[PDB]
């Protein structure tokens, strides 16, 4: 197999990154170091038109947690966007 996600991230231009850096900021609005833990992520859901619980929110973080830390960062967060690039399944 290969890395269709880790490859796209590195192949991102300032046009895309400039967009991800936006949510990454509102995603950690109140964090201590600069990561996510649902407490900050869910805060956006209410505005996104939804509101997941703290027990399920972990799914949004465990979907890209390759470090076993629990919180997401510019590394795991970015991939979370490539996996949902466009819907065509």
């Amino acid at each position: 197999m290969d890395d269709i996600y880790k490859a796209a991230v590195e192949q991102l231009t300032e046009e895309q990154k400039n967009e991800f850096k936006a949510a990454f900021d509102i995603f950690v609005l109140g964090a201590e170091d600069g990561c996510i833990s649902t407490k900050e992520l869910g805060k956006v859901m209410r505005m996104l038109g939804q509101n997941p619980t703290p027990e399920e929110l972990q799914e949004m973080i465990d979907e890209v947690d390759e470090d076993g830390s629990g919180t997401v960062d510019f590394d795991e967060f970015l991939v979370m966007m490539v996996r949902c690039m466009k819907d065509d399944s």
Binding site: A23, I26, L48
Partner: peptide, 17 residues
């Protein structure tokens, strides 16, 4: 899976007087 359309429409840009 993060509502790409409802993502910017809700936050990251919502100034409307």
């Amino acid at each position: 899976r993060i509502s790409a359309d409802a993502m910017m429409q809700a936050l990251l840009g919502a100034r409307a007087k």
